[PDB]
Design a protein around this ligand. Structure first.
Ligand SMILES: [Cl-]
Ligand SMILES: [Cl-]
Lengths: 297, 297
């Protein structure tokens, strides 16, 4: 999957350069000089999705660059905010404001709607996460909502705005959205998976954050096992030996193999969502990307 | 100034109701139920400026309601963020996202530009504040920038978008902007003033936040006085007696009378900025408002 991944990068090489130029130039604040030391310090596939999607639909113009920059600004600002100290909040807010300026300059209300609704979903997931983390009532169906918010919504928006700015027909656009949604879900399930499969390991477990493997394990917990889950997640109390026991319970209940399967299934869904589109070298790159996202499992 | 202030309220009575309905209905999150307990708990002249400005320019339609809601969403989200714990950041971000949805629905790229640039100014001030707070190099001219960001930019944007959505000519719009800018500056200088003039008192002093009265005092500090300023602001070290001494130095250097004068001058500037506009009952309300903002000094 290496040479296939490199081809996408090399094709988008120039646009990625010209984006990362914008990110650089807009992180520069007219008045305050106390920003660029933090922004440069913090500065990818999300902005790549937007450019790829634009080229796939034959876009000549300049605004795909704006939109891909917006996409990264939004991802970064969201990261800062999760790392919560005062310096983060306000710097993220700054990037949000800058992201908003960039989309407005494109002249497209449609993409603004798309990114406005996406930002709603993202922020809505972040809060849903607060509640659903450390809460053994959480179904998988509820975790998928969390995943969309925290992860997939931006993927799907990134790809969708790339098609919209290109002026693509509504079927091509829905397919771009579905590609990005499924790819984002796969992307995040892979992360979930690798937090167990071979510093990193058990992180979600200590964090008391309900990953899919944990949901699938808890879903089969007898009284004995429930007490263990009730204790290390909802009470937060953990000791020596507790990570090894959690992992044993995952394996006992096929929680990892089964999560691997959902990952692979969403990744196949991504590729299928490209089907109706007419053939195109970027179409191929996006297929390879769907495989690349799940290669590590 | 009471009956004159009440007339504005009573004229805008219905629109304010119908806005606070929106704020209520959009704070409701489809999926996550862990928001409305915080948003209702947190929910004014800013949204009033937008409605007033729309009516002043003869706007029939519905979007002045959207825009005034956006204005409050933005003010609130900004408040939350300054109060920084994790629950704040994400709830504010949620209101920002919701504010963005509302402006997009208006169909006006111009107002989006206005509010996108304003959001930039606001966030840019917040960061400039970090540096300029606890920094005796700060001139008044630098404080005015802080004031615009933290305060006036939203006033001026609130009034300006009200005129733009109404479709008013460019001269009427610039005057609305200038009214709101000067009014916001006056508004904030008044706050600065009342943090000394008669729990509240000395707050900015303990906070090591460079209010205008402090700038004007420091600006005249000899070596003896500088050492006192260098110590209680840049070193943060304060003892018994230090507030009384600061206040003495303000009076010694006419720092309050002089700040009062800048307040009054900006408020007169606000009213003058309405001059070219044709006469109108809301025009009168905005004049009274300019006097009302400075009545407490
Ligand atoms: Cl397994
Ligand atoms: Cl004085």
């Amino acid at each position: 999957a290496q040479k296939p991944h490199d081809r996408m990068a090399a094709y988008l090489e120039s646009d990625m350069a010209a984006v990362s130029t914008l990110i650089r130039e807009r992180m520069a604040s007219k008045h305050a000089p106390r920003i660029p030391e933090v922004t440069a310090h913090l500065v990818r596939l999300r902005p790549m999705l937007t450019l790829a999607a634009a080229h796939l639909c034959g876009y000549d113009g300049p605004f795909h660059i704006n939109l891909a920059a917006t996409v990264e600004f939004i991802h970064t600002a969201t990261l800062l905010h999760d790392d919560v100290n005062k310096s983060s909040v306000l710097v993220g807010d700054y990037l949000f404001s800058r992201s908003f300026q960039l989309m407005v300059e494109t002249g497209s209300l449609r993409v603004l709607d798309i990114l406005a609704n996406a930002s709603a979903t993202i922020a809505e997931g972040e809060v849903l996460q607060l509640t659903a983390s450390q809460n053994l009532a959480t179904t998988e169906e509820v975790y998928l909502q969390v995943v969309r918010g925290k992860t997939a919504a931006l993927f799907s928006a990134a790809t969708e705005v790339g098609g919209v700015i290109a002026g693509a027909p509504d079927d091509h656009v829905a397919a771009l959205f579905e590609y990005g949604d499924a790819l984002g879900i796969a992307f995040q399930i892979v992360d979930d998976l690798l937090d167990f499969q071979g510093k990193n390991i058990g992180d979600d477990f200590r964090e008391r954050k309900l990953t899919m493997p944990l949901i699938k394990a808890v879903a089969k917990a007898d009284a004995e096992e429930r007490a263990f889950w009730v204790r290390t997640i909802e009470k937060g109390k953990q000791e020596e030996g507790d990570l090894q026991h959690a992992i044993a319970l995952l394996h006992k209940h096929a929680a990892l193999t089964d999560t691997s399967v959902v990952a692979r299934t969403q990744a196949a869904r991504a590729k299928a969502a490209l089907a109706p589109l007419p053939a195109h070298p970027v179409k191929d790159m996006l297929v390879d990307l769907a495989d690349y996202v799940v290669e590590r499992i």
